[PDB]
């Protein structure tokens, strides 16, 4: 049948449950699954010391340290540092066992459990490829991936070159397709289609060939955005059908190769490159080995035909294993389809985008820019007001965009402050954000005490400020204004809600600062002089430097205004140094203090940059390998120290200091 | 830990702009 040759099965196989179970357990070649298993294990082994964070465990989980942490469940706590090193050691052993094929299921579990424990301990570390690694480990735990090229085959005769069920390939192919397609659909946002996300990514030197026929704006609009959307929406279909798999392979390989250099996403691109051949014939590695020299073949996996296996169903009544496998392949894929669109039961995790970041396949769609953050507290007994340094007890900045993390941060601060003689504190937050070059605006209500504010996982947060999407059309005029400025001038665009005010201290350096109204009506107050003046559309006002001024929004709708300022101090210093250098140069040519230190420092930095630029490519690559070598060696030595402490016991303090000094030594 | 009122209300302090891609491993 045409459908038989085009889809690999027939409508008759879906007639009944027994036929479906029989089809899903059809004997298949295990070679491609084995190659993917090896590559995935190898990449996990490489990734553990670098992005999973094994080389900074001592810094992250230092004992006796005051830190505010962001776990998914508030009752989840980390272990002491030595037990953290033990957990990471078990994870590494599991990854190695998965890569080798030795004790496949136990190794899968040993990688899986620690990985998800570490993943769920920190919400601020979630991204898409870590979630994908967890998903891949979970899938492979139930598969027969150790049936072709593995130590288990040498140890057991029944698992050497044996058939595998077809749902093993079906689930992996479905997962890859889901990744691609959900990313493509998420790329249908207006900001993406209009070219607002990654508007400056086309300046990279890799895009040089395209610029021979297109302008920079046209390149960014067409190639980056539209080509990315098209690849996402068509890659799965291109790879599935075998009349178009060559073009699909070429395009996907080029895409991932470019992405591996444009961004820093760890092993994501390499994992996708390794997953691409999963759509090819299941026996492709065996065919490749077929064309190898006889002497070489003695070092390569078997090339004969696979033997029958109990896993598959042959042209018998299916048993429990086959029915469980079919049920898994159905339910898991259905859940994977549903989850990225489930942000209507968990209403407490939506602020401006949907949900927590990491399980929706929306990569590089939204870009944020923060202008200012303020934290205020009031003593519960004395009543005095104070201000905290933003991010005082935190190791990440992701708390600024999520209400659950802000609630956790406020609780941590309220518990920690009493040890500095601040009793029953009330804490207020004031954060200004801009997403995809919009007006800067508040994201949380600045008059709400977050310590006592109400938060629930399944209820929409009350104290989140709505995003002002009616002001999006202003972006063109904003960009025009910004591009019309002089090279020593800067501008900030702000939009404020009715009934709110902005209190601003202008630094003494920022001489010649002014404010102009764009929409609505605002009242500007000079705090020192106690004077009120009202502005109208297009009216500008000069502001004093080194004083306070307040902007009240009295319009019934949000107002828009911009700040234009010049750094008077920097300009004067620059001019003086320039004249000094010119005079010295003229004296040296033949004609004719902190400033001298600044001039010499500038020259010193410039000289270093010149040498940095003029560096042989080989030298740079050599340094790259040495840096990577250091990272790995330090991780290994620290793990050894912690394991020894766990087993034998803690040695003398001087011994520990010497051991740490040895571990911290640079390579070669 | 604690700072002054002049610092807390300094909106136009130097420059504050970043790509802030949640996919990229910042550190
Ligand atoms: C009562 C019971 C009925 C209720 C159940 C509900 C029915 C839902 C559908 C369930 C059907 C499951 C399909 C199993 C069949 C299967 O896995 O076959 C596989 C298909 O593999 C997959 O699962 C595809 C991965 C998803 C990619 C989707 C993109 C293209 C859409 C069409 C897919 C069908 C084919 O095996 P093959 O290697 O022999 O050939 C593949 C294609 N060529 C020949 C080009 C290489
Ligand atoms: C057919 C199927 C195959 C399909 C494709 C195959 C897929 C397999 C992938 C194999 C690739 C191996 C590793 C790739 C390198 C890698 O992981 O990336 C590298 C990371 O490097 C690694 O981790 C591996 C490189 C070597 C590891 C170092 C350990 C030992 C060093 C080796 C010798 C040094 C010491 C000995 C002599 C002195 C890039 O790192 P980065 O993200 O910091 O890069 C920053 C630059 N940007 C971000 C701009 C890109
Ligand atoms: C404080 O800084 C601002 C911003 O740099 C200065 O505004 C600038 O004002 C000058 C005029 O004094 C503008 O020059 C313009 O020239 C065109 C012709 O080229 C003319 O058509 C305009 O009417 C205007 O005279 C200049 O464009 C403008 N710069 C910006 C970026 O707005 C301001 O002068 C500074 N104040 C002090 C006291 O130095
Ligand atoms: C306007 O320009 C002046 C410089 O002419 C800016 O002053 C500089 O601000 C930076 C950033 O705060 C200072 O860098 C940091 O300051 C500490 C403490 O002084 C110093 O140890 C380090 O240099 C540190 O990185 C810098 O020192 C300071 N001065 C100079 C000579 O650069 C000023 O910030 C600008 N205006 C505004 C409102 O930002
Ligand atoms: C061959 C010819 C003539 C033209 C090619 C025309 C083509 C395809 C250009 C492609 C270069 C380009 C503009 C790449 C960035 C586009 C963006 C933002 C993709 C978003 C994205 C990112 C950033 C990732 O890291 C991903 C990782 C794994 C899986 C999916 C990923 C993904 O969807
Ligand atoms: C300048 O105008 C603002 C805005 O009307 C004044 O702020 C108001 O002050 C009165 C008197 O305390 C309050 O009843 C209002 O609720 C305030 N409006 C707010 C906070 O939005 C401000 O007092 C005036 N400044 C001077 C120096 O006259
Ligand atoms: C020591 C403790 C904390 C670790 C125990 C491991 C548990 C919590 C892990 C192991 C396998 C994991 C599951 C693997 C796959 C998925 C599918 C994904 O779409 C949502 C998360 C979910 C459902 C995971 C939830 C957490 C999980 C059940
Ligand atoms: C806390 O210390 C401050 C001085 O830093 C002091 O004024 C205050 O009374 C102390 N509070 C208590 C409860 O001791």
Note down, in words, how this protein is organized.
- The complex is a heterodimer of chains A (668) and B (27).
- In chain A, helix 12 runs antiparallel to helix 13 and helix 19 crosses helix 20.
- In chain A, a hairpin with a 5-residue loop joins strand 3 and strand 4.
- Chain A is of the alpha+beta class.
- Among the domains of chain A are: 26 residues, no CATH class; 101 residues, no CATH class; 93 residues, Jelly Rolls (Sandwich); 44 residues, no CATH class; 47 residues.
- Chain A starts with a helix and ends in a 5-residue tail after the last helix.
- Chain B is low in regular secondary structure and 27 residues long.
- Chain B is 15% helix and 7% strand.
- Chain B has 1 helix and 1 strand.
- Chain B is elongated.
- Chain B starts with a strand and ends in a 19-residue tail after the last helix.
- In chain B, 19% of the residues are buried.
- Chains A and B meet through strand 1, strand 2 and strand 6 of A and strand 1 and helix 1 of B.
- The structure holds ligand 6PL (2 copies), a molecule of 3 linked components (NAG-NAG-BMA) (2 copies), the ligand CC(C)=CCC/C(C)=C/CC/C(C)=C/CC/C(C)=C/Cc1c(C)c(O)c2ccccc2c1O, a molecule of 2 linked components (NAG-NAG), cholesterol and 2-acetamido-2-deoxy-beta-D-glucopyranose.
- A molecule of 3 linked components (NAG-NAG-BMA) sits at the interface of chains A and B.
